[PDB]
RNA sequence: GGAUGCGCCUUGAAAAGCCUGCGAAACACGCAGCUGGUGAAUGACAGCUAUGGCGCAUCC
C-alpha cells in the first residue's frame, strides 16, 4: 500500500550535478520526515539528509553539507535530493526512506524506496564487448565474457531466460582501465553440446545495447 | 557526532541457532535505536524500533534489548529466510549514523570446487587483447594462482558470487589479461587452484587446438 | 461519512529555561478541568472528568 519510487540516477562526471526524486504513494509526505540514505558498492548504509514535517527543517551529513540540498514538492507528493559538485566517493545506490509515525514505529524508517544508482566518474558510457567462453566429469561449463562497459549495470540471461539451472553471473569488477568486466557461466550436460544451442543475452541499458551471442565448442 | 560500533562483522551459523548482534553507541542515545535487515540488491527492512519494540509484521523470533549504551538484536532461532545483512542505527541526534553491518551467512559442509579454464575467443584475439578465464564452481567455504609456463603471477582479478540459495556454495572467477602479442608467445596456460579440498588442483590448455 | 459501543492516545511542572508524553510533529508551533501528592525551584506522579484524534465491532 505504501510505496516510494525513486528516479533520476545515472552517470555524471566529477564536479557535476544530479537531481534524484522520490515519489510517494499511500501516504502524504507532509505528515512524515523523509530521509535519503546511501550505500556505496559493497559498503554499509550511510545517512545523507532529512527534511522534517510542518517546519521543513533540513539536516545533512558532514560528508555532504553545502553540496546537497533536500527538498519536497507537496503538490507532487515528491521529495528531491539535489546533488552538486559531485565526487567519486559519492558513488552509491541512493535510497529514499520514510520515517514512520512516532506512536507506531518511533523514529524507525518503516518504508524504503527501491534505490537508484549514482556513479560519479570521468569514464564515458560504453556498451560491452561480449565474447564466447567455449566448453571443453559428465557435465560441461561454458559462458560469456562481458568486457569493457560503463557504467553499471548489465543484465545477462541464457536462451531468452529459458536456461536457469546452474547459471552463475559474477559481480562486475572495475579494471584499471576504468571500465567494467564480468563473466556469466552455466554448467550443462556435455552430451547436449552437439544438440542444444546456448546463447547468452546481454543487455546494457545505459548504452541502449542488446546483444545475443551463441556459445559453441571451438575446433 | 555519535558512533555506532557493531559486532560481529560477519557470522556463519545454521538453522535453529540463536544469533545475537550487539551495537555500542559512543554516547547516550536513549534507546533511539533501530535495527534493519537487508538482502542483496534490496532495500533494508525495519525490524526493531526504540531499541526493543517489534515493528508491526516482523516475526517474534526477532527481539531487541538495551543496557545503557549497549544494544542487542537477538534472533531466537534462525530460519532459512533470515540470512542477510543486519544494521543498527541511532536516531537520537543528527546526523543519524549506522553500524557497519553484520553479514549472517549459512554454515555448511566443506566442498571442493570444480575447476574449468577457457581460452580467449578468436573474435577477442583479432581485437587486440586476449583474456583467459578460470572458473571455480560450487565450493565452500569462500577462501581460495596463474602459471603460463611456470611463470608465477599479466595481473588478474577475481570475482565471487554470494552464497547460492540452493546449496549454500560459492563460485569464483579469475580472469587473466594479456596483449595479443604476449598471448601468442608462450605454450601452456595453466590455472592452479588451492582450497580446503585435497591437494592443489591445476587445469590447463595450450593454444594449439 | 451518520448512529451505537469498545480499545489506545489526548503529558507532568508550576514564571522563564531545561528535560519528558502527545498532536500524522526529534527543530519550530500547539496541548482543558478537579482532587490528592510533590516543588524554599523541583519532572513525581496517582485518581477521576472534559475535549478531540486514530483504530476495532456493529447499524444505515
Ligand atoms: Mg492534565
Ligand atoms: Mg494525569
Residue numbers in the entry:
A (entry chain H): 4 to 139, 145 to 227
B (entry chain L): 2 to 145, 148 to 156, 158 to 201, 203 to 214
Manuscript text:
DIR2s (DIR second selection) RNA aptamer obtained represents the second generation of DIR binding RNA aptamers that bind to DIR dye and activate its red fluorescence. The aptamer exhibits promiscuity with respect to dye recognition, binding with nanomolar affinity to red fluorescence emitting DIR, as well as blue fluorescence emitting oxazole thiazole blue (OTB)5 dyes and their derivatives. Our structures reveal that the DIR2s aptamer adopts a tuning fork-like fold consisting of two short stem-loops and a proximal helix. Using Fab BL3-6 and its cognate RNA hairpin motif as a crystallization module, we crystallized and solved the crystal structures of both apo and ligand-bound forms of the DIR2s aptamer.
We also determined the crystal structure of the aptamer construct complexed with Fab BL3-6 in absence of fluorophore at 2 Å resolution. The apo form of the DIR2s aptamer adopts a highly similar architecture to its ligand-bound form, with the two loops L1 and L3 held together via the same hydrogen-bonding and stacking interactions. The two structures superimpose well (r.m.s. deviation 1.816 Å) with the exception of the aforementioned nucleotides at the end of the helix P1 that could not be modeled accurately and local changes in the ligand-binding site. The most prominent difference occurs at the apex nucleotide A40; relative to its position in the ligand-bound form, A40 rotates by 180° around the glycosidic bond in apo form and points upward in ca. 50° angle relative to the A40 plane of the ligand-bound form, making a hydrogen bond with the aptamer in the neighboring asymmetric unit. Nucleotide G39 in the apo form lays offset by 20° to that of the G39 plane in the OTB-bound form. Both loops L1 and L3 of the apo form are shifted toward stem P3 by 2.5 Å compared with the OTB-bound form. Ligand binding to this largely preorganized aptamer requires a simple rotation about the glycosidic bond of A40, and thus, likely imparts only a modest entropic penalty. In neither case did we observe crystals in the absence of Fab BL3-6, suggesting that the Fab facilitates crystal lattice formation.
